[PDB]
Amino acid sequence: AKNASEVSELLAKSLAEKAVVTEGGKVVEGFSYVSKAVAAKVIATRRAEVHE
Amino acid sequence: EGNSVAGIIKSVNETSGANLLSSLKTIKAQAAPIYPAAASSTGYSTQAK
């Protein structure tokens, strides 16, 4: 019970990382999205390799 | 013995960016020309004698 906080944030993080999308409440079948942190990581690796 | 500029080009291209500026004096000294050092004398050769 003194790692109940960590198992609670682990449930919330595991639910948030597999977050699905809904259009009108109906779940969209087969929807893949590239985030803004993912796109900025792609930009940063590309900038780093062109700078080297 | 290939030419030292292609050696510089190859030795710069296959180095990561983390250890590029550390490795630059090694590539500078790998492609500096050979100036042979002063060997031991053994003077007065056969034609001088």
Automatic annotation (TrEMBL), chain A:
This is ATP synthase associated protein ASA1. It comes from Polytomella sp. Pringsheim 198.80. The chain holds residues 207 to 258 of 618 of the full protein.
From TrEMBL, chain B:
This is Mitochondrial ATP synthase subunit ASA6. It comes from the Eukaryota.
